[PDB]
Amino acid sequence: LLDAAPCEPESLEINKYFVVIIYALVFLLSLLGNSLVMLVILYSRVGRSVTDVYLLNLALADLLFALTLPIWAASKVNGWIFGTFLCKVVSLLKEVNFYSGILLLACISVDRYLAIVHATRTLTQKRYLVKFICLSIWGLSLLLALPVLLFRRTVYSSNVSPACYEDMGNNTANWRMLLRILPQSFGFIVPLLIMLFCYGFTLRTLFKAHMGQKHRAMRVIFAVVLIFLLCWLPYNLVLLADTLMRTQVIQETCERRNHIDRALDATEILGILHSCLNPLIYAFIGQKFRHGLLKILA
Amino acid sequence: APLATELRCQCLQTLQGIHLKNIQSVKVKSPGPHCAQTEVIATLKNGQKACLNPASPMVKKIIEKMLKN
Amino acid sequence: CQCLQTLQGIHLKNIQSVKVKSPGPHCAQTEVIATLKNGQKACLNPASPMVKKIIEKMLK
Structure with missing residues (x-):
């Protein structure tokens, strides 16, 4: 009988409450960094190059992603209790x-x-x-x-x-x-x-x-x-592993499902850091942006 | 109470012949966003949960007898 | 018993799952509880042919 029993999903509130703080921290950092990049680029129209336009679009995208993050954090806390309309809108x-x-x-x-x-x-x-x-x-x-x-x-x-x-x-x-x-x-x-x-x-x-x-x-x-x-x-490696498992390429078991779920959660947290790290890598790693930011602060 | 971003089927393999005397309840779930196949899960009187094969005539007989009461 | 009075008007297009509970210490009458796609739970009469129709359609 134990040979054929339902797979019971596995959870851990220890990580559920910790993911909230991780998401909040990333939200704050992305908000601040993207806002500063936007302010520096949009303050003075002098020297607006191709790179500045690309960075402005990238900052807009990252800021919108970060702005959606908190709803995702609340969902992770207690599941999607917000209705179908917000599911569609936030997902889009x-x-x-x-x-x-x-x-x-x-x-x-x-x-x-x-x-x-x-x-x-x-x-x-x-x-x-x-x-x-x-x-x-x-x-x-x-x-x-x-x-x-x-x-x-x-x-x-x-x-x-x-x-x-x-x-x-x-x-x-x-x-x-x-x-x-x-x-x-x-x-x-x-x-x-x-x-x-x-x-x-x-x-x-x-x-x-x-x-x-x-x-x-x-x-x-x-x-x-x-x-x-x-x-x-x-x-994407974890996603490919899941796709292979669902198609019977890799043998399926309850523990493997738990492992893939944990990996998906961790890797989503890891990938969410692009919004925070983009401003430091593409914008503030160059002297022009730092000089501009110092100029604005006056 | 738990969470998941990947809904998966509730049965990996199924059996046929669970005796009604040991059945407390039966749950039938039709295909949907969870699984591409119907799922039958019998909760026994001792708490053990056993998956069942929907195609087997035994499952249909058990369900009909249970409904007849 | 998890049901007092049975409901009606449940189409197969709105049912997500059906759970059939047999008599026991919990309740002396067989119960059928259907979980709809909107999360609400509806109690169905086991003797009604509608439940049998739903279950047989699902098993197919």
């Missing part, structure tokens, strides 16, 4: 801004590639399309977040608390697994490959250069790539 905002952030990082990568590698060539002139590239990225992000709005509701279980989950009919499991392809291809793989190509060739050109500031630029590029990987690779 969160996913739109997630896609926007990733694609803006890829755009910044391509911009730096064109500015450094093709500095002598005429292709660098094509990096003056920031406004329409950013608008297209926002549009694509809005397009890719439609399934979240269309197929989400508050699902009530019998052994678990209500969740802002999907409802796609009798085959919701398989459709959800397929819909997972979008966040893992337009959200991890394609941006990761674009960033790797662009920054690899950028590093190849810099290493052969004779500048005095090549070294700091190389360190900054390495930090950007490593932060992106640290933030997003673990979550």
Whole structure:
């Protein structure tokens, strides 16, 4: 009989209450950093370059994501008790801004590639399309977040608390697994490959250069790539593990389910730090922004 | 009381032949956002929970006898 | 007993699950409790053919 018994979900309030403080801390830090980046960029219109436009869009996306975080924290505390309307709205905002952030990082990568590698060539002139590239990225992000709005509701279980989950009919499991392809291809793989190509060739050109500031630029590029990987690779690895398990590729057991759930929680917490870390890596690591910020404070 | 961001089926494998004398209750859950297959879970008088195979005639017989009362 | 008077008007499109509890020390009468997709719980008459229809449709 024990050979065939239901898998009992496993929880731990010790982490439930700790996740609230983690989310609140990230909320505050992202709010402050993105607000400062926006203020510094928008205070003076002098010297508004392509990078400034990209950073302004990125700060907007990160600020919106952070602004949605607290509702997610309360949900983690007590489950989605807020209704279906807020489930759809908050999910749409969160996913739109997630896609926007990733694609803006890829755009910044391509911009730096064109500015450094093709500095002598005429292709660098094509990096003056920031406004329409950013608008297209926002549009694509809005397009890719439609399934979240269309197929989400508050699902009530019998052994678990209500969740802002999907409802796609009798085959919701398989459709959800397929819909997972979008966040893992337009959200991890394609941006990761674009960033790797662009920054690899950028590093190849810099290493052969004779500048005095090549070294700091190389360190900054390495930090950007490593932060992106640290933030997003673990979550997508855990997601792929779950997808493999659901399809019987990896044998399924209760303990493995518990492990994947814990991993998903931890990796979501880890990935939520991109909003906090973007302002430090892309905006305040350059002398222009720091000088501007010091100027404004007067 | 617990939490989860991934709803999963409540049964990994199923049996057939649970004796009604040891059945306290039976729960039937239709396909939905949780699982792609119907789930039958019998809670016995001693607290043990046993999954059942929906296709087996035994489950249908047990349920109909229980309903007849 | 978890039910006093049975309900009506529950369509199969709104039912999420059905739980059938047999007689015992808790209650002397068989009970059927249906969990709807909105979280509300509805008590159904076990003798009513509607419960049998719902259960047989679900098992299929």
